[PDB]
Write a protein that binds this ligand. Structure first.
Ligand SMILES: *[C@](O)(C(=O)NC1CC1)[C@H](CCC)NC(=O)[C@@H]1[C@H]2CCC[C@H]2CN1C(=O)[C@@H](NC(=O)[C@@H](NC(=O)c1cnccn1)C1CCCCC1)C(C)(C)C
Ligand SMILES: *[C@](O)(C(=O)NC1CC1)[C@H](CCC)NC(=O)[C@@H]1[C@H]2CCC[C@H]2CN1C(=O)[C@@H](NC(=O)[C@@H](NC(=O)c1cnccn1)C1CCCCC1)C(C)(C)C
Lengths: 306, 306
């Protein structure tokens, strides 16, 4: 038993990280096959950040302006293209450590593991969730951009995020592996507001099941509710509205514990209006929303990976 | 910026995990060089657990009673010895992926990363601390024993824990890599109490510095205290007493922020007696004690690994 913020093993990703340099800027790139992907602002100088014309900037850059390294090994750039906000650097040497991967774009509420790196070298791994406002609350310092977020499906690494920037509020934003930002952000140094954030209701319910699985059942009650009646209370506390789909995804956890999802919603409803009254759930004094139903099943069922 | 429960990249450890079988028992082993280390209770049957005589049990076992696998690859056991509560299986094939390692025994309050595995396959990675009562609050299921805890020092993996069992309270216990349990536990199925647990004061102070580094400074005050006066309040709230050594280890964080350790103790003192009054620090409503001063520096300074 037990329950922790568990991340995916990062072995498969560690072997794809490289160091990319252009001018005085050094950041990380993702080396898969014979391509190195990295944030396109790597070609900008501090003066260009205000209002960059990436197309024109890229046109003035030649393959030898890009120094790419993989430890000692220096890769040779054969070509450079730009896809959305991501830069693709064709290289002479293909990556032998290229795992079986794919690029996916996650949705708000879904979670993934982040391999924070600096100078192409791994620093740590942690789990986090894509917030409803499309930002993430990560832990990144200068030099971290190019670090990626990923998930694993047995033997397939799914890359879903590349780090690009930080907001004054302390949160982070980036794109998927096709270069499209998550959220309304653009890569230029201007004030850009992230929408209001909300609590990922489905995740909170999953965590509550996890607690029950782990013997913490004090918050359980005999009352019941309807999806409509629950949502009315939820929206008042800035919680995402719960949909029938959410209910279906929580089915497995409901099956395993014998507690209907609406019965669980009824307990959550009470907790929102009455608070936790000095008690904790799974060691926390706040309702945790960064565990998906799948994360709970995986951790409580012991799903492993090739 | 940002602050998360960060674990070490597990690449180097993933390649040392193997599956060990003996009779109807299958668990994980650690394959380094030509030795596979695993919990010695792998030779026991359910009936032997009550009061096992490991020496006699081991004597009745022959090298071919141990099936060891590394994916498809089947290793061949050439010999079997027992060191304390750990079993050493000499093998015909040495591990090519054997990293530059060493075995260390940590102290209460120190943290490490755990690579949870099942059937020799990795499941996830998470950070945790050795509690003052020598247990750990991990996340492990049946089949998890042999999973290890480790740290990394540039290019050297330091193994400091091997999982053996779980207490009814839900916490976990195991040994170091030389087979000595952490705590007063013995590997037999009998009631065995873990001592009273306490809060790792030095860690809490480190986390407070982390918060300051991250802009959360509301709890700061102009008062000051003495180590003796602080400790008197601390012991009342079941906090470990703070020693001059602790103070010295917190020096780097004090240097970086310009806040004396005793000034920080004075803020913590107030928080203990007055509470957080509906506020949070680094997103938490409780004082976190599973981050060492080093963990804070590493995460706030961006230390990486070969
Ligand atoms: C990343 O490229 C990296 O690791 N580089 C290595 C060190 C050399 C780097 C990581 C910084 C911690 N990211 C950036 O430099 C991005 C790039 C890409 C988009 C613009 C520039 C600036 N930048 C930032 O992360 C900055 N943040 C901002 O510029 C935000 N600005 C404001 O909040 C703002 C702007 N004008 C007026 C008032 N406020 C913007 C906000 C909108 C979304 C994009 C980021 C810093 C300050 C470096 C964190
Ligand atoms: C591990 O070997 C594994 O992953 N095996 C794979 C599935 C085949 C396994 C993991 C279990 C979740 N560990 C154990 O089986 C250990 C071994 C080693 C020491 C004794 C046996 C039993 N065991 C346990 O983890 C059990 N826990 C206990 O036996 C605890 N007992 C009590 O609390 C107790 C005992 N008698 C009366 C009342 N209470 C003892 C407590 C003292 C310290 C050692 C553990 C289970 C119940 C399987 C978790």
């Amino acid at each position: 038993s037990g329950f922790r913020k568990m991340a995916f093993p990062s072995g498969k990703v560690e072997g794809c990280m490289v160091q990319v340099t252009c001018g005085t800027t050094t950041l990380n790139g993702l080396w898969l096959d014979d391509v190195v992907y990295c944030p396109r602002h790597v070609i900008c100088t501090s003066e260009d950040m205000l209002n960059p014309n990436y197309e024109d900037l890229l046109i003035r850059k030649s393959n030898h302006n890009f120094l790419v390294q993989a430890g000692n090994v220096q890769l040779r750039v054969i070509g450079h293209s730009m896809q959305n906000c991501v830069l693709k650097l064709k290289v002479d040497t293909a990556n032998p450590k290229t795992p079986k991967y794919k690029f996916v774009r996650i949705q708000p509420g879904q979670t993934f593991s982040v391999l924070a790196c600096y100078n192409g070298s791994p620093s740590g791994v942690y789990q986090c969730a894509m917030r409803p406002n499309f930002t993430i609350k990560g832990s990144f310092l200068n030099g971290s951009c190019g670090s990626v977020g990923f998930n694993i499906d047995y033997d397939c690494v799914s890359f879903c995020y590349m780090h690009h920037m930080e907001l004054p509020t302390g949160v982070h934003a980036g794109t998927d592996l096709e270069g499209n930002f998550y959220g309304p952000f653009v890569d230029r140094q201007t004030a850009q507001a992230a929408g209001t954030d909300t609590t990922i209701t489905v995740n909170v319910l999953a965590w509550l099941y996890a607690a029950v699985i782990n013997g913490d059942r004090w918050f359980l009650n005999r009352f019941t509710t309807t999806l409509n009646d629950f949502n009315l209370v939820a929206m008042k506390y800035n919680y995402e509205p719960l949909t029938q789909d959410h209910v279906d995804i929580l089915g497995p956890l409901s099956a395993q514990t014998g507690i209907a999802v609406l019965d669980m919603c009824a307990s959550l409803k009470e907790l929102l209006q009455n608070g936790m009254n000095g008690r904790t759930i799974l060691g926390s004094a706040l309702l945790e929303d960064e565990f998906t139903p799948f994360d709970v099943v995986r951790q409580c069922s012991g799903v492993t990976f090739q």
